Nucleic acid binder design. Sequence first.
RNA 1: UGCAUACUUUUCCUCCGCCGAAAGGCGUAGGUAAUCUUUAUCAAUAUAUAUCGUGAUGGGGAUAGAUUAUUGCAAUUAUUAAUCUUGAACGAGGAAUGCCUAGUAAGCAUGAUUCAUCAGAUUGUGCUGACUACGUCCCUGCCCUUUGUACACAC
RNA 2: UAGCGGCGAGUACACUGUACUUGC
Lengths: 96, 128, 157, 154, 58, 98, 180, 41, 138, 48
Amino acid sequence: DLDKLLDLSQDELIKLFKARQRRKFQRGISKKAKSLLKKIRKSKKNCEPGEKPNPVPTHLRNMTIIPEMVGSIVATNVEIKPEMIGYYLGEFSITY
Amino acid sequence: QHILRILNTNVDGKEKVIIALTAIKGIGKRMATVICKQANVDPTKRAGELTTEEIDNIVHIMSTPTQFKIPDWFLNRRKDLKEGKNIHVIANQLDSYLREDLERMKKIRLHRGLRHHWGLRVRGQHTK
Amino acid sequence: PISKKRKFINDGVFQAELNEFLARILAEDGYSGVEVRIRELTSLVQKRFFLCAMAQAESLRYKLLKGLAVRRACYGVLRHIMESGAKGCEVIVSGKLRAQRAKSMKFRDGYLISTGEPSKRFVNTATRSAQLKQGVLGIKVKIMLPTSILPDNISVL
Amino acid sequence: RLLEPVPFVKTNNCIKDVDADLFIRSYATHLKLHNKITYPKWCTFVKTGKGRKLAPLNEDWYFIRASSILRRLYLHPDIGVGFLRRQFSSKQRRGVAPNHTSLASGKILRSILQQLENLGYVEQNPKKKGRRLTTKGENAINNFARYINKKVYN
Amino acid sequence: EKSKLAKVEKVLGRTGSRGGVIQVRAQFGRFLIRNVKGPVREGDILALLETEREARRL
Amino acid sequence: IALTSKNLRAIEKVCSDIMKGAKEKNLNVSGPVRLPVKTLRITTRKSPCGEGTNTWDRFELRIYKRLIDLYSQCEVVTQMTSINIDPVVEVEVIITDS
Amino acid sequence: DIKLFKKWSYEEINIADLSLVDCIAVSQKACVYTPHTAGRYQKKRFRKALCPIVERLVNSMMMHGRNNGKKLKAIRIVAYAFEIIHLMTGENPLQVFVNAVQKGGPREDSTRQAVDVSPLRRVNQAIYLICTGARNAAFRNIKSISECLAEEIINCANESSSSYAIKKKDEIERVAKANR
Amino acid sequence: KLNHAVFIVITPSAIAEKYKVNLSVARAVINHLADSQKLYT
Amino acid sequence: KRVQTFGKKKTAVAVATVTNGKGLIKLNGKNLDLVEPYILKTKVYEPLWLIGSGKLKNLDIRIRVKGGGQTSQIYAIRQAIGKGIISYYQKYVDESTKKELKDVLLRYDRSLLVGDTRRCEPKKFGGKGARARYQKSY
Amino acid sequence: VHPKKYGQGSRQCRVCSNKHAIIRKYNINICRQCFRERADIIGFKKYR
RNA sequence: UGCAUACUUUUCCUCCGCCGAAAGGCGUAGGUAAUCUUUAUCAAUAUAUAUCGUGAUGGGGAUAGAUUAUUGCAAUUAUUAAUCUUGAACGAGGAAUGCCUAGUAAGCAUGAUUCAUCAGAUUGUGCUGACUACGUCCCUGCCCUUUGUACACAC
RNA sequence: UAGCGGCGAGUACACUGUACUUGC
């Protein structure tokens, strides 16, 4: 289930993902996303597991969900799950 | 002769054999076509002389055609992202797993899922 | 090595550039021709790259802009145009005309055709604009050159 | 019904003297009888082109298309994948979008050309870039054309 | 039923509500007025319903 | 020697000079070559603002291009061309031997 | 010499109404092997009748729905209809169609009172009405187009009740007689 | 709503109306008797 | 010996060349019989019946067609063969027959020698078809 | 700045300096607005 | 893998030979262009033969599901795209409405424009060449002479 | 840069040039 996802590397991760995410991850990750990943791993390593973690400031709608950053929310409280990984973020104004 | 009944209606007595095979399920005609080819049933005949042996050959072909040459890409519902792998699961159970994926996307609850729940098309029906 | 069609395009582009530059500079005289005083023009162009109807229109713009009456200015310019040799003339002025109610007025005489392939091939046209106290003035002048003979003309001796 | 009075003197020295459709069906029969090429086992699960979108429903399409390809190979003595696609082009229905054509799939043409190269009817040369019939194929199919002519003539 | 043969010696005039009538000196008893629809040239042959019916010249 | 312009009178007069010069200098010269004319077009619409009926006008660029060939000296041919051409024309050189 | 489809030289023609021969204008200069004459039809007023009657019929035929201008099917269908009529009935299909056009076209119409039909307009009306019957028959009625043409042409030739052309001719003449 | 079958002038439409059959089975009968449309035999 | 003529109607064009022979007439590589339509084949044969095959039994009329539609190419080759047989009667085989030849041709129709200029009409704006105006919604 | 060498922002008309109504046929890359009145001097001619 | 830097020339269509159902991927012919795409030939209506033979059918494809590849730093609001699955109207259209007189109606397509990707738009181009007048002001809108106006920002 | 050819070497048939390749 999730142990293999969290241990296995990025090329087999894109193989798991659709070819859309394969193309995206091959062509670009960039400094913004790498710094975002470092921030999220620090926040998840410091925040208590007994409470769900905090959202990501400097919000963006084009960050792909990767199992190596579990727990995060956005600042619209849907949690990014293993069934959420390939759908990107979205989560914007849709109020009826 | 005519009027032989299966899990799905096969009133196609006068109807030609291939369209009779397609009408029961896979109304896109083409997985029915590949099942017809694998079971190797001739087209010159009609559906009035279809044998129960031929029906059993159809259902044996349909039961996991992956062991046959039928390509992974030509397989309906190729990935259906999970730990396992899925397949064309025949009419009633195909709709059952359609419900399965539908409830999974409900608990996904994204823009398009809530759009459908609110009663709209995905790309935008453009009622404007 | 540029394709011939795009070389024609470059030809026309630079023709437009030189046309606008000539319009900008040739404001203290008519048209003494072009070159394929002179020193500054040639140096600037090299650094960058590597009867007279338009003159009469510019002169009328000058006369209007320097502060002379519209009616006397157009009368004198008509006199000069007639003395130049053209069969007829047309000047049209658009602007404030000393009121908040816009007004316009043509100066026609002679045959003064305006439509068609022969009319365009014969009659020279020009248009200028200038700033004003409360807007912009447009001065458009059409002067027909004397007539190969005009197609309609028939006279037998 | 098919023969028509030809009132001028015939030459009948090649396949351009004989009709395309009867030739392609007759030599498809010859090819099926002689088993020069395989089915092949891979052709039968894929449509000949996306715009067709539907099954061939003839069971002889590989060999019939191969015979037509030979016909085209002589008719234009330098042809390839593009020529085959643009000779076998068919329209397409793109959904709600209107009718618009597209060239058929290329791998069936590639396989037929590969098998013809294996059998030695067509050769590849840097000059006259398109595929051309070899001299052996030329003489063989000229005699075949006159064979068909005399067969369906008298 | 039946007809009576006639020739056209001339096309008199086009009239009607919308130009859909053409008065014709057609043929049974030499002089007979008629109304025709469509293209009649000089030298046509027409048919007549009744011998003694007359139109209204305009 | 290829000849290119946007008006045909210029090419007519230049080629007439070329033929007469070839006749006078008695050279081995190729005959007139009349290429199919090539036109360049663009479709435009008036009304720089969006109010009004849709009217569209087309533009034409009939560029004229000819070819000739002479057995002569490059310097003398370029000299007489430079003497008797107007730079509204473009000429390029290519020579024959037999 | 010249024969229709290498078959029909039409060496005999009925006298008709003394105008129908001139209007159909079938002649040595108008003899043609097959349908689809692309010659000029729109020069003068008589250039409409100058076209052969068979050409008028075949060029009128193909008009319905998607069938705009399908003149190759027009030619094939009319040729097979000639053969079908020749088979099911021993009379020459040419003279059968000539009888159909001499008995099908209405003679008097009513617009405002009544007006006579110019003989060219009678040829055109007969062709149009036979076409209306043909299109009614070809609008989802099982049978083939050539067979429907056989039925309509033979019935308009023999004044049979199965002829929509004859039915509408009776309609038109009844209206004209009841009004004027 | 078709009501015909295959179980019981050679033209397809005439034969079809004769035996009250479709044109496909009519052409099958035509082949079985003489042994898309075309000029009559 | 040898003559060459032309034929132009609709979009298709045809080029013909009459040479001495035994009656070998070629439209490129294929016959005039294999071109598919018996309908157009009849019109192609019309010149042969209106001239004669015995006199063609000694001439080879080389013919090429390139472009246009099927009907257009048929009319183009008919025009080309008419002009070519006219010129070859004028030139080589026999002269006094050509007067009766053109007599019969012109009597039967004037289209055979010279074809129509009826070609496409340049499209105007305001609609999809050339003679169609955009639908007006009041 | 965050520039790209494609799309509307990659180029603008030489004279109007606006990213709207840019035609690139035969590399002219001049706004149609100015092109309409520049047709004569550049060389573009309307005939039919 | 990154920044700084020196070189071929990547920056257009592409034929071909291969890889891939395809999407697309790999290397190279040609051309600043009647010489390479391609054009002694690039579409479709057809045409001819075979499956089907008028039953909302097997027609029809709205509907959505699983993805493969590219385009683009960025496609999630599923751009495009190949596969497979999905089966809405529709028995030919009330009151009204538009356009049209000959290679044109109409039908069938196709070129180019904006272009990193995208025609269902606009503008050209071509194939199938038809039914029908060749006139009338009755309707609608305009031009005219006369008349009557208490209308002149003008019913 | 388009073609019409002529014969220079031909690929198979006719017989007392032709379908298809190469160049001046």
